Amino acid sequence: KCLDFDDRTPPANTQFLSSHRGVYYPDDIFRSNVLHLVQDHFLPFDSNVTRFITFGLNFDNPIIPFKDGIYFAATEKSNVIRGWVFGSTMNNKSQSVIIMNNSTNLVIRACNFELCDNPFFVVLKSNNTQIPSYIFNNAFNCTFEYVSKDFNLDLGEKPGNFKDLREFVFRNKDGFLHVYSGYQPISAASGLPTGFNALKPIFKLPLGINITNFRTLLTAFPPRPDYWGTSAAAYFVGYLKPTTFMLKYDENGTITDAVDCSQNPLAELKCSVKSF
Amino acid sequence: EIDKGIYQTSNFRVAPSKEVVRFPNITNLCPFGEVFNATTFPSVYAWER
Amino acid sequence: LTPSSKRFQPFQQFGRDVSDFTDSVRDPKTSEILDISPCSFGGVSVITP
């Protein structure tokens, strides 16, 4: 239990360009066929996104600093990504929260956690069975816990390009993790494809704690015990910046396109004219 | 006395007939009584939100 | 108040126009989007010889 895996290949901190993706709906207010300018945190266009790879050559579960909300993208086909852990220090002293799809359900536990320094799910190959994984060795002083509806969680291995793109925005506004989600079914070979997405909100979680750190949650696909194998997996981490944005809303009240004012002088003009 | 012509004088008004009054269905009773009647009150340094 | 026919996302609760005025509201008890319309204003003028 609580295994730590040796000689993991370093991620090397490979960087890539961001794109028009990373946009989410600012509020529940419905506006249709209208051009609106708003200040908020967003992912800047063409910014650098850090690609962390768990393909199998490298495994990385590094403690990633949670700065002013993060844009996460997971490009995967076997649903290898399971969840995340968000906490200030995660040294069993401070409050931390765990949001995952562990076996069949969405579980969110805000409890003081003996964070295994290498937390990994254990999924059986050719058996499609999750061997019990110690995400937390123990729990104590558990403040907030929410179990969502059970669902069929696909854990089998599929060979190919990463067929799926799960994208999330985590904003720690006041004491609330605001998560805005979306998915894209396009499969990309090895790059975070260029495009825009509009992220609908899911949970306004009232955690009420400071989050300075976070670590995504991966799973094992070891064909043999103690071998610690993993399948092809890749994901992208981007930080958010307080820059104003220019959003176009169709008649359907859905975000169709946006412009970053600060990016380009012509974009600045587009904002000042409030025209595209 | 007024000579011939058109003259704007007033502003027409339609008054509301009644009220719709729609709120959610929450009926649970709030624990503000419990908070106020809390048997022990923490210190000002340990003031709790 | 009339029914509102604009498409509405479930998280979207208040529907608002260009001026960010609620032209559409979701009833709490019946999540029916409702078109909101102004009340019949105008000017009173007098024709006279």
Ligand SMILES: *[C@@H]1O[C@H](CO)[C@@H](O[C@@H]2O[C@H](CO)[C@@H](O)[C@H](O)[C@H]2NC(C)=O)[C@H](O)[C@H]1NC(C)=O
């Ligand atoms: C808003 O969404 C609706 C529903 O998805 C779209 O209405 C569809 O329009 C296409 C093309 O006219 C038709 O083939 C479908 O039958 C319509 N479905 C429904 C349920 O109305 C509408 O076109 C969208 N408006 C946009 C994107 O501006």
Ligand SMILES: *[C@@H]1O[C@H](CO)[C@@H](O)[C@H](O)[C@H]1NC(C)=O
């Ligand atoms: C993004 O990365 C490029 C090269 O990797 C670098 O020149 C640029 O300064 C970076 N931009 C940042 C870190 O904002």
Ligand SMILES: *[C@@H]1O[C@H](CO)[C@@H](O)[C@H](O)[C@H]1NC(C)=O
């Ligand atoms: C758990 O946290 C407590 C204090 O909150 C600490 O004393 C203990 O050492 C922690 N557990 C481990 C395994 O370090």
Ligand SMILES: *[C@@H]1O[C@H](CO)[C@@H](O)[C@H](O)[C@H]1NC(C)=O
């Ligand atoms: C997943 O979480 C739920 C809710 O806490 C729990 O009942 C279930 O046993 C967990 N499954 C695994 C494999 O950890």
Ligand SMILES: *[C@@H]1O[C@H](CO)[C@@H](O)[C@H](O)[C@H]1NC(C)=O
């Ligand atoms: C909160 O955790 C501390 C130890 O970190 C413990 O002493 C305390 O009893 C816990 N509070 C509750 C309500 O369990």
Ligand SMILES: *[C@@H]1O[C@H](CO)[C@@H](O)[C@H](O)[C@H]1NC(C)=O
């Ligand atoms: C997080 O915020 C709290 C409250 O402002 C503060 O006490 C703490 O130093 C911050 N950092 C960490 C790592 O908890």
Ligand SMILES: *[C@@H]1O[C@H](CO)[C@@H](O)[C@H](O)[C@H]1NC(C)=O
């Ligand atoms: C609220 O309660 C009324 C009275 O029973 C009921 O008609 C209505 O459907 C309820 N709506 C919701 C959203 O609970």
